[PDB]
Amino acid sequence: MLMPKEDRNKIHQYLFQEGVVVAKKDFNQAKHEEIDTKNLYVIKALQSLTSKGYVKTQFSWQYYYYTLTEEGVEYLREYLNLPEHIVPGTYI
Amino acid sequence: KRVPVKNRPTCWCGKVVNPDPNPLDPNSCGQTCNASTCMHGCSKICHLGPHPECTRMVEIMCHCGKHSKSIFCYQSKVMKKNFNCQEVCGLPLSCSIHTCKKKCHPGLCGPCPEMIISKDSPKKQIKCYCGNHTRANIKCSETKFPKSGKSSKDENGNRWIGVFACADNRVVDYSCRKHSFIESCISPPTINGEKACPFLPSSLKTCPCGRTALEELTKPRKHCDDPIPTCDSRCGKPLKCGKHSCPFTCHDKACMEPCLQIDSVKCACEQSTFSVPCGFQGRPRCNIKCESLMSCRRHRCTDRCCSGRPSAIRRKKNLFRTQDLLDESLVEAKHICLKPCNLTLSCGIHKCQRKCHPGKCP
Amino acid sequence: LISKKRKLVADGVFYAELNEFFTRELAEEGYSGVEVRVTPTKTEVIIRATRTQDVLGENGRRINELTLLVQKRFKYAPGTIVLYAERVQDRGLSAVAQAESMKFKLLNGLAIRRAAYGVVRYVMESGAKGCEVVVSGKLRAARAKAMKFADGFLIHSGQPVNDFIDTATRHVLMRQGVLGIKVKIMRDPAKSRTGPKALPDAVTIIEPKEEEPILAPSVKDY
Amino acid sequence: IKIRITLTSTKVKQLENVSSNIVKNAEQHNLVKKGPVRLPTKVLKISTRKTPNGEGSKTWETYEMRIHKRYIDLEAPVQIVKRITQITIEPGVDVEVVVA
Amino acid sequence: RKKKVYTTPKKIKHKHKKVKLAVLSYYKVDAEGKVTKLRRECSNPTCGAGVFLANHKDRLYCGKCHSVYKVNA
RNA sequence: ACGGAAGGGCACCACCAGGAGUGGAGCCUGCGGCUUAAUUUGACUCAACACGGGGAAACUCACCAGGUCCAGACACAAUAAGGAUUGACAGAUUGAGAGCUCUUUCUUGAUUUUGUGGGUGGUGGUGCAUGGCCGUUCUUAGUUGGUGGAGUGAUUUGUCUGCUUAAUUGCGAUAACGAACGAGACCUUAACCUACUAAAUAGUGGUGCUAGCAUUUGCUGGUUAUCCACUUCUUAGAGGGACUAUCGGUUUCAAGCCGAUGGAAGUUUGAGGCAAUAACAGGUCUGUGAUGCCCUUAGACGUUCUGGGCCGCACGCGCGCUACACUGACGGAGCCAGCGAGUCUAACCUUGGCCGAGAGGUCUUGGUAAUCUUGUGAAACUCCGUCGUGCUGGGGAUAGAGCAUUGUAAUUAUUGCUCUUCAACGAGGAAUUCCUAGUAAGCGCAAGUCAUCAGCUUGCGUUGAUUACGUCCCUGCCCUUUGUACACACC
Ligand SMILES: [Mg+2]
Ligand SMILES: [Mg+2]
Ligand SMILES: [Mg+2]
Ligand SMILES: [Mg+2]
Ligand SMILES: [Mg+2]
Ligand SMILES: [Mg+2]
Ligand SMILES: [Mg+2]
Ligand SMILES: [Mg+2]
Ligand SMILES: [Mg+2]
Ligand SMILES: [Mg+2]
Ligand SMILES: [Mg+2]
Ligand SMILES: [Mg+2]
Ligand SMILES: [Mg+2]
Ligand SMILES: [Mg+2]
Ligand SMILES: [Mg+2]
Ligand SMILES: [Mg+2]
Ligand SMILES: [Mg+2]
Ligand SMILES: [Mg+2]
Ligand SMILES: [Mg+2]
Ligand SMILES: [Mg+2]
Ligand SMILES: [Mg+2]
Ligand SMILES: [Mg+2]
Ligand SMILES: [Mg+2]
Ligand SMILES: [Mg+2]
Ligand SMILES: [Mg+2]
Ligand SMILES: [Mg+2]
Ligand SMILES: [Mg+2]
Ligand SMILES: [Zn+2]
Ligand SMILES: [Zn+2]
Ligand SMILES: [Zn+2]
Ligand SMILES: [Zn+2]
Ligand SMILES: [Zn+2]
Ligand SMILES: [Zn+2]
Ligand SMILES: [Zn+2]
Ligand SMILES: [Zn+2]
Ligand SMILES: [Zn+2]
Ligand SMILES: [Zn+2]
Ligand SMILES: [Zn+2]
Ligand SMILES: [Zn+2]
Ligand SMILES: [Zn+2]
Ligand SMILES: [Zn+2]
Ligand SMILES: [Zn+2]
Ligand SMILES: [Zn+2]
Ligand SMILES: [Zn+2]
């Protein structure tokens, strides 16, 4: 799905720092909470990451809970160009 | 996810496949695993079990950068979000007569907030652009130096910088110095007679109301003495009060201070609004009784449109302690009750000699 | 600034949504329920499950991601919401846990009678007064039917149903369609410890202690 | 000092034991108090058709949630005020304390 | 659900693809001399020194400005 | 299982004695039919038809006439920074400042585009492929093991002749004994408590302060910071209380039943909630991100935008609402409930003041609520008048004109208000519904839906009768016996 590279990156870095992301199933909302990108953009970007085994999705009353996997955190690490085990969303 | 590859026991580090058997370190080369959480890597040698907390201290700085903090990598990151040296920033504030009084802080010092207190000298007194009002103190940023950039000038023309303007309104004379027009306190307000005369044909080619040129509206008056031709469009001349301009049809003379236009003013009771012209001397009175508590609180004030009542309503609205209710001074003087208490004493065979008072008799 | 009616309905719907979320994601962890405790400066969410090690993960990583999930969705401040995991007792006396275990057995490919008799034997062994499991749907044929498997005794009417029977219903998504699993467990009223210890119509007469007839007047003195 | 404690649960027994240990703590500390005023129980009713579709006999069904509210007025100094608001935490019982 | 006759006319008329030209960015060509810039830029510096201001007829047009910079040179 | 077979027992979804009706009229609303571009659709005896919470202006929305967009993940291959692709002013075009498409060029830069696979969505089909839920059989008393007994067996007994009960409820009898579910118990609600604990968010009395009328002292009020006292009324928590008590009849003289007394209460005290086994090819894929299969998937049956439609009217049906007038209409007065609901990052329930015939407007105010709206000052009702047996001052359908409110929008009138118009209807044929006491009936109120819109529904109180206290005639239900050529079971 066509979106700009910068807000694709914004979605990806929010996913990397927080480790989870909750997106209400409300297309045309045009402003996600906690991310200044459109809700449709975050939903479809995370669906694309879900398809390549990088994040898991749970639906549960119209809200799309996403949690990224280990292959996902490694992929986002080398995607956003961070050093190995710099800072994932897995702090003790 | 997957079956271990056949024939691959590893060193505890995993760095080395086919670990050399060591009785001292089982399944281990014995060289540091060095898996890097802390960038340096695990301090301990390869082992069964996870890596211990990092031992290398790192240095981060306080908000202003003046001091550093050597903290262990394992904790430092958290400590980082909290470090503050707290030495005062001290940077000169923009006014330049002040220095930031804030302690070490992230970001800029911000606006000078040093209160400016006029010292006890006439020159020292802070004043208005008109210079009518002298003020004891103001915030430094809040001082607004005149946009004109000219100091307040009076008839003397002595210029003392004004950093605010008083609200008061003053009339300013025409050059003719015969008739005058009402105006507001202004930056460097003009001396009387400085203003060009509307009545004089040469000085003003427009109507008193302005709006359209005077010549187009009517033939221009021959002389300054001759009145400027009045026109239907409203003059809009400022009132002495300044609450409103003027909706009257244009007139050559200045707008009269009394106003046919009545301004709604609410009574002390506030339950009623009486419309009175601007410049009215008095507070509106409505025939209703105050009906509010006396200082004793055993009686209700019967005065009509009492001066004490608005204060009493506000006093009631404010949260009052039991002590506060007992105190007579908080209650307004008009409301204070001077009647004799006339209540039985502790014995009950005597009457209180005191005047009516809140609380139990002595 | 909310009325008490709307506040209590709102935290009821919050409990219902949280329970639905947990039963959607923690199905393979033996999720057996949730409890909410509001506290000055903190609200705590107690998950009652069987596999607490799978609920937690390494250093509670799944717990951290579940706290972050419920936080992000329900707009809580950092530190205001905390989740704990707790190993439920008497797993045989948990209709939701038994229904989920039966669902996963049927999905893995166990026979219906073998799975149902396994769950009824486990519940009866766990000290229940009775168990009853119903499987409904297309069983070995295009025409649907219902199979019932019971042991012990179960009651059906009155307030003791709310007191003693626990029931759960699950949807099993087989390749021919949906099977319905219904599990009813009547616990022993004697082991309750919270509320009535017996059925309403149970009457216990205590045994009179027998004393020998004295047949002689006597006086004890001090 | 004029504090008021409001308890607004749906669980009668937990509400009553919270009220009881607050009032016994108050009389143990010898605090003058207005006793637990029990407001009218407010019943929240929702009436629905039983059927998910619309056929059959028109059978209706009323569900209700009962809210029980109590309040206690206390005149106690501030240290016992914080100890009271730090003690008596019960699941399902909503407690709020207000001053003046 | 019978069928769709499509009484609306034959209008499968899907547009261009940002029409594929040859090489672009014609500034100008100069033998052993400096090249200037044809299609002079928008006065808005949000659209500055990189945008070719369009020249259709009787107006000029911007994409970096957005859609609106209408002047008649 | 059925019987136009028998015996016993029952039920106002049966009758009897009656009450209110409905069926006749106008209108409202749902269904069919017809009509239509479309008038989306499910459901058709009880157990479809004011039902899908279905009171649709847009939305909802599924239908019709048209216009966009992709929200086609992912993989592979191709094109490809000498550029994959995206967007767009103006004009043309279009209902449309939709570049949708075209002219003209700018802009973007690896996200895309094209093809194959594979997905995704679908209020598309299938409720006769399903889950769950609901309805119904079936508001009645019924259902099942174990071990014994009978039978070659299907099966039977237990689970029964009598009597009793609302009840396989019990007394009992007894090839059965001991059990389980259902019934009952239970739980919620309504009735009682001058007994307990209390209450400035409930009240009452007294004392302060104060008004009016009287005159020793009284009566009716106002004011809570003016304080004190109390808990009868009110609200809860904890308990008490009824168990058919006592007495008298009657019955193998048992279970029980009938009368009287006492009692707040004596039809299991009233009303509910819960509610077995076995089933229906009942309803529902249009509640569901519940679902299998089938269909479709980019000029899509996805989704959105604009405009229509769901309301269209020769007709036939089912819920209802207003009435045919004096046991009334109208006008002034009088003047009394209970159940409830309400605003935060919003704009809800709204007192009071002012303006306006009204509807409404406006300035404020209290209330996140036992406090404020709200004593919800409701309506029927009472009392004085006006009318006067005239389709009449009964009735208010159908029309015309104007003023307001909700809403982006009211044209096929959203509702409200004002003046005018003033139709059927003179108590309703065969038929047919519901109902036994604070019940029927009358009367309004709150809530649901809800921006606006009740002639609907779910509850609530106000006023309050007649007539049974039975029966098996009709329509059905339970149990037993009996006949059967029935077993998809008398259609
Ligand atoms: Mg009867
Ligand atoms: Mg009938
Ligand atoms: Mg009859
Ligand atoms: Mg009628
Ligand atoms: Mg029936
Ligand atoms: Mg529509
Ligand atoms: Mg539409
Ligand atoms: Mg659709
Ligand atoms: Mg069916
Ligand atoms: Mg079904
Ligand atoms: Mg046998
Ligand atoms: Mg035998
Ligand atoms: Mg047997
Ligand atoms: Mg008084
Ligand atoms: Mg007797
Ligand atoms: Mg009963
Ligand atoms: Mg369904
Ligand atoms: Mg319709
Ligand atoms: Mg009906
Ligand atoms: Mg009339
Ligand atoms: Mg009248
Ligand atoms: Mg009332
Ligand atoms: Mg409507
Ligand atoms: Mg309504
Ligand atoms: Mg309706
Ligand atoms: Mg025969
Ligand atoms: Mg046959
Ligand atoms: Zn090693
Ligand atoms: Zn380190
Ligand atoms: Zn290590
Ligand atoms: Zn510092
Ligand atoms: Zn300064
Ligand atoms: Zn500073
Ligand atoms: Zn001044
Ligand atoms: Zn002059
Ligand atoms: Zn003029
Ligand atoms: Zn003037
Ligand atoms: Zn004035
Ligand atoms: Zn006064
Ligand atoms: Zn006094
Ligand atoms: Zn006044
Ligand atoms: Zn004395
Ligand atoms: Zn005194
Ligand atoms: Zn530009």
From Swiss-Prot, chain A:
The N-terminus is not modified. It is found in: Cytoplasm. GO terms for molecular function: RNA binding; structural constituent of ribosome. It comes from the Eukaryota. Component of the small ribosomal subunit (SSU). Mature yeast ribosomes consist of a small (40S) and a large (60S) subunit. The 40S small subunit contains 1 molecule of ribosomal RNA (18S rRNA) and 33 different proteins (encoded by 57 genes). The large 60S subunit contains 3 rRNA molecules (25S, 5.8S and 5S rRNA) and 46 different proteins (encoded by 81 genes). eS10 interacts with GCN1 (via middle region); this interaction is direct and promotes GCN2 kinase activity. Present with 54100 molecules/cell in log phase SD medium. Belongs to the eukaryotic ribosomal protein eS10 family. Component of the ribosome, a large ribonucleoprotein complex responsible for the synthesis of proteins in the cell. The small ribosomal subunit (SSU) binds messenger RNAs (mRNAs) and translates the encoded message by selecting cognate aminoacyl-transfer RNA (tRNA) molecules. The large subunit (LSU) contains the ribosomal catalytic site termed the peptidyl transferase center (PTC), which catalyzes the formation of peptide bonds, thereby polymerizing the amino acids delivered by tRNAs into a polypeptide chain. This is Small ribosomal subunit protein eS10A.
From Swiss-Prot, chain C:
Ubiquitinated at Lys-209 in response to stalled ribosomes. Ubiquitination leads to activation of the No-Go Decay (NGD) pathway and degradation of non-functional 18S rRNA: first monoubiquitinated at Lys-209 by MAG2, followed by formation of 'Lys-63'-linked polyubiquitin chains on monoubiquitin by HEL2 and RSP5. There is a cross-link at residues 103, 129, 138, 148, 197, 209 (Glycyl lysine isopeptide (Lys-Gly) (interchain with G-Cter in ubiquitin)). The modification Phosphoserine is found at residues 94, 126, 218. Keywords: Cytoplasm, Isopeptide bond, Methylation, Phosphoprotein, Ribonucleoprotein, Ribosomal protein, RNA-binding, Ubl conjugation. InterPro entries: KH_dom-like_a/b, KH_dom_type_2, KH_sf_prok-type, Ribosomal_S3_C_sf, Ribosomal_uS3_C, Ribosomal_uS3_CS, Ribosomal_uS3_euk/arc. The modification Phosphothreonine is found at residues 41, 67. The modification Omega-N-methylarginine is found at residue 143. The keyword Chloroplast does not apply. Component of the ribosome, a large ribonucleoprotein complex responsible for the synthesis of proteins in the cell. The small ribosomal subunit (SSU) binds messenger RNAs (mRNAs) and translates the encoded message by selecting cognate aminoacyl-transfer RNA (tRNA) molecules. The large subunit (LSU) contains the ribosomal catalytic site termed the peptidyl transferase center (PTC), which catalyzes the formation of peptide bonds, thereby polymerizing the amino acids delivered by tRNAs into a polypeptide chain. This is Small ribosomal subunit protein uS3. It comes from Saccharomyces cerevisiae (strain ATCC 204508 / S288c) (Baker's yeast).
Swiss-Prot record, chain D:
One of its GO terms (biological process) is cytoplasmic translation. Transmembrane segments: none annotated. There is a cross-link at residues 2, 13, 82 (Glycyl lysine isopeptide (Lys-Gly) (interchain with G-Cter in ubiquitin)). N-terminally acetylated by acetyltransferase NatA. Also partially acetylated by NatC. One of its GO terms (molecular function) is mRNA binding. Coiled coil: none annotated. It comes from the Eukaryota. Keywords: Acetylation, Cytoplasm, Isopeptide bond, Ribonucleoprotein, Ribosomal protein, Ubl conjugation. GO terms for cellular component: cytoplasm; cytosol; cytosolic small ribosomal subunit. It is found in: Cytoplasm. Component of the ribosome, a large ribonucleoprotein complex responsible for the synthesis of proteins in the cell. The small ribosomal subunit (SSU) binds messenger RNAs (mRNAs) and translates the encoded message by selecting cognate aminoacyl-transfer RNA (tRNA) molecules. The large subunit (LSU) contains the ribosomal catalytic site termed the peptidyl transferase center (PTC), which catalyzes the formation of peptide bonds, thereby polymerizing the amino acids delivered by tRNAs into a polypeptide chain. Belongs to the universal ribosomal protein uS10 family. Component of the small ribosomal subunit (SSU). Mature yeast ribosomes consist of a small (40S) and a large (60S) subunit. The 40S small subunit contains 1 molecule of ribosomal RNA (18S rRNA) and 33 different proteins (encoded by 57 genes). The large 60S subunit contains 3 rRNA molecules (25S, 5.8S and 5S rRNA) and 46 different proteins (encoded by 81 genes).
UniProtKB/Swiss-Prot annotation, chain E:
A zinc finger (C4-type) spans 42-65. The modification Phosphoserine is found at residue 43. It is found in: Cytoplasm. There is a cross-link at residues 28, 34 (Glycyl lysine isopeptide (Lys-Gly) (interchain with G-Cter in ubiquitin)). Component of the ribosome, a large ribonucleoprotein complex responsible for the synthesis of proteins in the cell. The small ribosomal subunit (SSU) binds messenger RNAs (mRNAs) and translates the encoded message by selecting cognate aminoacyl-transfer RNA (tRNA) molecules. The large subunit (LSU) contains the ribosomal catalytic site termed the peptidyl transferase center (PTC), which catalyzes the formation of peptide bonds, thereby polymerizing the amino acids delivered by tRNAs into a polypeptide chain. Component of the small ribosomal subunit (SSU). Mature yeast ribosomes consist of a small (40S) and a large (60S) subunit. The 40S small subunit contains 1 molecule of ribosomal RNA (18S rRNA) and 33 different proteins (encoded by 57 genes). The large 60S subunit contains 3 rRNA molecules (25S, 5.8S and 5S rRNA) and 46 different proteins (encoded by 81 genes). This is Small ribosomal subunit protein eS31.
